[PDB]
Design a protein around this ligand. Structure first.
Ligand SMILES: Cc1c[nH]c(/C=C2\C(=O)Nc3ccccc32)c1CCC(=O)O
Length: 283
């Protein structure tokens, strides 16, 4: 069925499958221990299909894997480690982020899981801008950059997930909610949300939204605002308010990421330099 790839295959007996991770946002993922990769076990996350999965589901998953193979490694993205593709279920072994996604990570450290500093937060921004910059350099458009799609390792390293995901943009239901109850269209740039044009620029728009979340510690964008009301806000050029406990400088960065004209938004290469500078000057 699946063609062999000596470059990534791992014997099945080397992957001790463990407890399910998450509630199903990134599909069916489980924690596991990979022996070898010979006498050391490495905790990894394993992506697999469900029993009632369709051949389409199989295709897309294969597509996501081949995508991760072409893109290459980077500290700030979820990296592919191997795969079990022969004589059995397709197992995609990727890096494990023990602390889960960023949204919940940020929420869990809000003052009434210890509190994060201004530098810790600006450092989160930096790391994500860096994962994105590399992804952009590799010709990859994410299409759904949000705190929920950023995972945190036990060492607090921010990693972008879902970047190699397979998706027909001309099939996206604007009313479908995230598992947490939010509307993904709230992270979309106007041109993407309206004209279905995804570019590194629309990803930058999303980064502005992700920055907002960081500085509101898991804040939900546009609370109570439904899809049709959102369109109207965007049509009228509406921009979210500056989070309290946020410098004017970082709000301006958010505002620049949300520039009306795509060509005028900063690049990830630019944001990385700006964030690198800010982090150093941050208490
Ligand atoms: C708590 C937690 C720890 N790890 C994870 C998930 C993942 C993980 O650790 N590595 C991955 C690679 C790709 C997709 C998901 C994961 C969760 C769940 C995160 C979630 O579903 O939002």
């Amino acid at each position: 069925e699946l063609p062999e790839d000596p470059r990534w295959e791992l014997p099945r007996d080397r992957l001790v499958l463990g407890k399910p991770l998450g509630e199903g946002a990134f599909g069916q993922v489980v924690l596991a221990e990979a022996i070898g990769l010979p006498n050391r076990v490495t905790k990894v996350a394993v992506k697999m299909l469900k029993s009632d999965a369709t051949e389409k589901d199989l295709s897309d998953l294969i597509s996501e894997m081949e995508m991760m193979k072409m893109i290459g490694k980077h500290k700030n993205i979820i990296n592919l480690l191997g795969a079990c593709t022969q004589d059995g279920p397709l197992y995609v072994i990727v890096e494990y982020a023990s602390k889960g996604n960023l949204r919940e990570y940020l929420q869990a450290r809000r003052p009434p899981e210890e509190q994060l500093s201004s530098k810790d937060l600006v450092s989160c921004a930096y790391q994500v801008a860096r994962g994105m910059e590399y992804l952009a350099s590799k010709k990859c458009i994410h299409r759904d950059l949000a705190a929920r799609n950023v995972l945190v390792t036990e060492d607090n390293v921010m990693k972008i997930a879902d970047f190699g995901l397979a998706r027909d943009i001309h099939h996206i239901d604007y009313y479908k909610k995230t598992t947490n109850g939010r509307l993904p269209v709230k992270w979309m740039a106007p041109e993407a949300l309206f004209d279905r044009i995804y570019t590194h620029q629309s990803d930058v728009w999303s980064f502005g939204v992700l920055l907002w979340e960081i500085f509101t510690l898991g804040g939900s964008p546009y609370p109570g605002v439904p899809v049709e009301e959102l369109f109207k806000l965007l049509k009228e050029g509406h921009r979210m308010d500056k989070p309290s406990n946020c410098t004017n400088e970082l709000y301006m960065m958010m505002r620049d990421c949300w520039h009306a004209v795509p060509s005028q938004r900063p690049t990830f290469k630019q944001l990385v330099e700006d964030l690198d500078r800010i982090v150093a000057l941050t208490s």
